[PDB]
């Protein structure tokens, strides 16, 4: 509720009014402090969601994502204070302002009690990210990249706007509790499909499914490090949160209309993971891997099965923490080599031995190696999907088989092998990069002991 919001927004005057060089320090202090307070919100009751007021409420689904976003907030500050050191204090302050303003919106939307209120800051997250990708992005095609990312989501979000207000004029309020209790069987009338399509496509776009995913490779690669993590670790997941919330009034229409997306997602994950097997760009390879994992959640959410929701929430968080880490891996390597081609800097393990380890559990976590939370996600989803149909395991398991090859492919090409002779600027890794990397992996294994925290309201 408020105990998270005002501390987040009151953090903004601090960064603006802090000393010239202390900006990174005091921002990091209370961002971690905010994370601690958010963790206090992680508690949930049995069945009734933790409701605070007409404006804000939390459930067993929102809380794990809330603590994840606040937990993220220190990490971009940690990950960004290397390529922004040679910048004017105002621009550094502006950069920090963008992140916490972005993070502030995330707390708002996840705790939003009204769908329209959920909707207003659903796209409002775009404005800070658009600035981050465009201004501080370090590339040339970032301009076209920002346009692709911006227009795709709007093209899907605006139908939701017309759909959402239609609910208000037809079924009174759009309070999440009032929708759930007063749910009615959506008919099969040919208007209700376009009703169904509008209420779904908005979350489809910013949850890249095959076909509606070309923004993500352009979104991730040209975005700066902080932009890439926030976009891949939370931003691809507003779509996820919407579906678990909005599919309450899409049944039984979801039963019949689910087919085109399920085939698109299940086949897409094989295709996308195949792209990972032959990606020339390390950041792009990680980006395409996010599509495969996210497309798995598409099948998870859209099956509408108790087990499927549970594994979704497991992959909901685990992928986000993992994808942020892998982007950190690529970023921590990038500036040393000043290039994105994977084969540019081979045999890094012989030069940097600890990064060899950090890359190693990172690849293992993305492998869904048990008992990592990723395995709990994928394995739960497979069982739910298998109950839905026996055939899907052929597609399901094949993804894990492909996921194995490309995951260690980056490991062998970069970490193992012969070091590149020509390069000589690879310095011993700063303990900031090392500290940040453990900041990611350590909570992941810490979460393994308590899956019930992140299983969700279906748990």
């Amino acid at each position: 509720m408020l105990k998270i919001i005002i501390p987040t927004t009151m953090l903004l005057p601090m960064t603006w009014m802090s000393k010239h060089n202390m900006i990174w320090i005091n921002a990091t202090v209370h961002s971690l402090l905010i994370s601690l307070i958010s963790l206090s919100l992680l508690n949930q009751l049995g069945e009734n969601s933790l409701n605070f007021s007409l404006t804000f409420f939390s459930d067993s689904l929102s809380a794990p994502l809330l603590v994840l976003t606040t937990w993220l907030l220190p990490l971009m500050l940690m990950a960004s204070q290397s390529h922004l050191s040679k910048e004017t204090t105002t621009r550094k302050k502006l950069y920090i302002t963008m992140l916490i303003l972005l993070q502030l919106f995330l707390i708002m939307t996840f705790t939003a009690t009204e769908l329209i209120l959920f909707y207003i800051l659903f796209e409002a997250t775009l404005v800070p990210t658009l600035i981050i990708i465009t201004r501080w992005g370090n590339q040339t095609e970032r301009l076209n990249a920002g346009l692709y990312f911006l227009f795709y989501t709007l093209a899907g979000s605006l139908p939701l706007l017309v759909a959402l207000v239609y609910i208000q004029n037809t079924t009174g309020s759009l309070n999440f509790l009032i929708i759930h209790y007063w749910s009615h069987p959506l008919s099969n009338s040919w208007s209700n499909i376009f009703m169904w399509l509008a209420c779904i496509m908005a979350f489809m776009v910013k949850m890249p499914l095959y076909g509606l995913h070309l923004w993500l490779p352009k979104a991730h690669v040209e975005a700066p490090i902080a932009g890439s993590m926030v976009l891949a670790a939370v931003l691809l997941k507003l779509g996820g949160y919407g579906m678990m919330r909005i599919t309450t009034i899409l049944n039984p229409l979801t039963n019949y209309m689910a087919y085109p997306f399920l085939m698109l997602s299940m086949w897409g994950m094989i295709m996308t993971s195949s792209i990972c097997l032959r990606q020339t760009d390390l950041k792009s390879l990680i980006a395409y891997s996010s599509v495969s994992h996210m497309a798995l959640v598409i099948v998870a959410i859209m099956i509408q099965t108790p087990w499927s929701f549970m594994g979704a929430t497991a992959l909901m968080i685990a992928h986000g923490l993992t994808s942020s880490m892998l982007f950190c891996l690529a970023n921590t390597n990038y500036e040393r080599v000043h290039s994105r081609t994977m084969i540019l800097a081979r045999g890094l393990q012989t030069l940097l031995p600890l990064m060899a380890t950090w890359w190693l559990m990172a690849s293992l976590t993305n492998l869904a190696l048990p008992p990592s939370i990723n395995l709990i996600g994928e394995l739960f989803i497979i069982t739910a999907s298998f109950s839905w149909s026996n055939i899907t395991i052929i597609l399901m398991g094949m993804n894990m088989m492909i996921t194995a090859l490309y995951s260690l492919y980056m490991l062998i090409t970069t970490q193992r092998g012969k070091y590149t002779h020509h390069i000589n600027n690879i310095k011993a890794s700063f303990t900031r990069e090392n500290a940040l990397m453990a900041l990611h992996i350590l909570p992941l294994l810490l979460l393994t002991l308590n899956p019930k925290m992140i299983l969700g309201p279906l748990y």
Binding site: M1, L2, K3, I4, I5, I6, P7, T9, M10, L11, P13, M14, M17, S18, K19, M22, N26, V29, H30, L33, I34, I37, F52, S53
Partner: protein
Amino acid sequence: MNVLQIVRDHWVHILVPVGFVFGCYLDRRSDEKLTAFRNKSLLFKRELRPNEEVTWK
């Protein structure tokens, strides 16, 4: 000890902490308007104790 300057450069550190203690205040103020069914739901409604007058604040 330089306090005229440690205050100037480290007065920012108190902003968020008071924000949190402020955040609890509206949290513990907004709930008052939400009293309505206080000790009214038959699941939890029960006999009011000799001294305390409000079951849940």
